[PDB]
Amino acid sequence: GRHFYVTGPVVRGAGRGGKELGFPTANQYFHDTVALPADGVYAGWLTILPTEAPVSGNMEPEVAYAAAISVGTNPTFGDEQRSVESFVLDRDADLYGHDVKVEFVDHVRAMEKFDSVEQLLEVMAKDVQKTRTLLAQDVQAHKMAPETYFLQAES
Ligand SMILES: Cc1cc2nc3c(=O)[nH]c(=O)nc-3n(C[C@H](O)[C@H](O)[C@H](O)COP(=O)(O)O)c2cc1C
Numbered sequence: 001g002r003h004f005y006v007t008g009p010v011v012r013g014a015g016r017g018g019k020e021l022g023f024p025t026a027n028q029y030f031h032d033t034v035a036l037p038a039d040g041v042y043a044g045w046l047t048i049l050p051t052e053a054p055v056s057g058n059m060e061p062e063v064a065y066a067a068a069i070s071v072g073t074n075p076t077f078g079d080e081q082r083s084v085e086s087f088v089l090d091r092d093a094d095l096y097g098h099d100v101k102v103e104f105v106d107h108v109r110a111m112e113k114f115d116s117v118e119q120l121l122e123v124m125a126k127d128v129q130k131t132r133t134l135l136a137q138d139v140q141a142h143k144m145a146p147e148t149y150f151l152q153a154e155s
Pocket residue numbers: 012013014015016017018021023025027041068069070073074075076077085086087110111112113114120124127128
């Protein structure tokens with residue numbers, strides 16, 4: 001399809017996204033043989049795949065949730081493995097162990113090594129802003145039915 005996508009279980013990262021950055025990210029790791037988009041930041045959709053497993057929080061399966069997505073090694077922090085990491089906008093759910101699909105709709109920015117967490121946070125806020133606008137255009141492009149996605153303006 002026109003959206004690059006990957007699927008796989010949400011697994012444990014460094015534990016810093018929510019606690020330290022205020023941007024929790026659902027982490028996926030793939031073998032180096034698996035085709036991925038270029039390291040960078042993307043606007044896209046995260047969907048919990050069809051399942052009978054209970055989901056705790058305000059996300060349910062088979063709905064495309066607006067997400068700001070990073071691909072790479074988190075060079076600001078010097079992490080060892082390449083991850084795909086999805087910050088689901090305006091939601092709060094326990095995704096660990098759930099099988100999810102992540103669709104990459106638009107490239108937003110190159111992956112960058114920032115000197116400080118504070119500088120990184122300022123830029124991530126702007127990535128989220130651009131993600132909202134890009135995803136509203138994508139809704140229109142596919143004439144997506146309201147029940148099939150979740151996308152808000154921020155409070
Ligand atoms: C939209 C978005 C943009 C990001 N941009 C960068 C970046 O430019 N440089 C970087 O080192 N990490 C970037 N990250 C990743 C954060 O470093 C990472 O998600 C955070 O350290 C949490 O790590 P963890 O999930 O293992 O706890 C970005 C993450 C998101 C969600």
